[PDB]
Amino acid sequence: HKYHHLLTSQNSPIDWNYHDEEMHKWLDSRKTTNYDAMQKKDGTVIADIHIPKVFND
C-alpha cells in the first residue's frame, strides 16, 4: 500500500499524464488509419457500419 500511494502521488516514478496522453493520441490515429483502410477495400457506407465515428470515449 505504501508503493501504491507512491505510484499515485506526485513523486511517482511513472509520468502517468504523459503516458495517458500518448495513448489517446495513438488510439485516434489508429481509428483514422483503420477507417481509411476500409474506405479503399469497401465503400464509405460499409466503413461507417463497422467503425462508427460517434463512439470515442
Binding site: 500500500h1 505504501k2 501504491h4 500511494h5 499515485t8 502521488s9 502517468w16 495517458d20 495513448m23 489517446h24 488510439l27 485516434d28 489508429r30 481509428k31 483503420n34 477507417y35 476500409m38 463497422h50 467503425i51 462508427p52 463512439f55 470515442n56 470515449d57
Partner: protein, 57 residues
C-alpha cells in the same frame, strides 16, 4: 482505496485529496479502455507462461 490514502496522510484534508487523486486516475483509465474497442484493432490478452514439464526444484 482508503488503505493507500491513509497510509501516510496526517490530516483529513490530506486523506480526501489522496482519494480524489486515485479516482481521477482510475476514471481516466476507464475511458481509455472503452476507446480501445472503437479503434478497429484487436486487444491483446494477458497470459502466463509455464514450463511444459515443470521440475520440482
Amino acid at each position: 482505496v482508503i488503505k493507500p490514502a491513509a497510509v501516510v496522510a496526517g490530516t483529513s484534508t490530506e486523506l480526501i485529496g489522496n482519494l480524489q487523486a486515485i479516482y481521477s486516475r482510475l476514471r481516466s483509465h476507464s475511458d481509455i479502455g472503452f476507446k480501445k474497442a472503437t479503434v478497429g484493432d484487436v486487444i491483446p490478452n494477458s497470459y502466463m507462461i509455464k514450463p511444459v514439464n515443470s521440475t520440482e526444484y
